[PDB]
Amino acid sequence: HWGYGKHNGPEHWHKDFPIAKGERQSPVDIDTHTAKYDPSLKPLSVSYDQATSLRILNNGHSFQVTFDDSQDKAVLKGGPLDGTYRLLQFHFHWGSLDGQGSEHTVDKKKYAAELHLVHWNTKYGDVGKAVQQPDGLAVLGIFLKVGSAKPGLQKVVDVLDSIKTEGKSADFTNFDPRGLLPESLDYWTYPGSLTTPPLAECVTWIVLKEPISVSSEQVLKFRKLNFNGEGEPEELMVDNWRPAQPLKNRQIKASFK
């Protein structure tokens, strides 16, 4: 099965998922001097006040926090998007060292990690139908750098001990994802894909320019998770990121000058 090792990592994924070599794959390098300011882009609307978190889970390739998406509770609108996108889950990608771990890069710079808030377009009724559409999902991507702690992340960090290995989950109610957002909503946007199998080309990417800072102790807790299930040889869950893919016939748009 697919993963991030030498024999099953991103350079192998195209064999099971040939769209891996497609025309709108993610992530990409964001060349800040070539991205064009688009004054027709609207402010992003992030409406998370009624978010209802449900569970936190180790799925063998990351950890994710899932939300109730059976009603318009936590939604993303505006920016480049048409219509209403409901928050389904968030998860992270991170490195073995602070100089790598993000999926998107900025002028080839890699951050220590990247947060993905995954939303689906309610005009398609369910996420499984949305993944089959070119505008079915919107992922809000936020870079993490190591410095000061992020207080809004600590409740996540403190439960990771309870989901060390693949398959483990725990109750994770009343978590407020607004605590993970930087001050500015300035962003870059481009049409792309899921960055893990099935690599479906269904994502409007919205990548915030401002990173959040997390502490060394917080990221070290990410690096203590395991890719393996309980009972198997321990392989630390680190470097669970796909590298930048060819931009091909796409333009990256900036919301800001």
Ligand SMILES: NS(=O)(=O)c1ccc(CCN(Cc2ccc3ccccc3c2)C(=O)CN(CCC(=O)O)CCc2ccccc2)cc1
């Ligand atoms: N990094 S990212 O770009 O933000 C990024 C963001 C989001 C994803 C989603 C990947 N995904 C779907 C999938 C689809 C096909 C696959 C085929 C082979 C291998 C894996 C696959 C994964 C899942 O996690 C599993 N579904 C969760 C819901 C959903 O589909 O979202 C379960 C489908 C299911 C099954 C039973 C009950 C409920 C739901 C990837 C990358």
Ligand SMILES: [Zn+2]
């Ligand atoms: Zn992701």
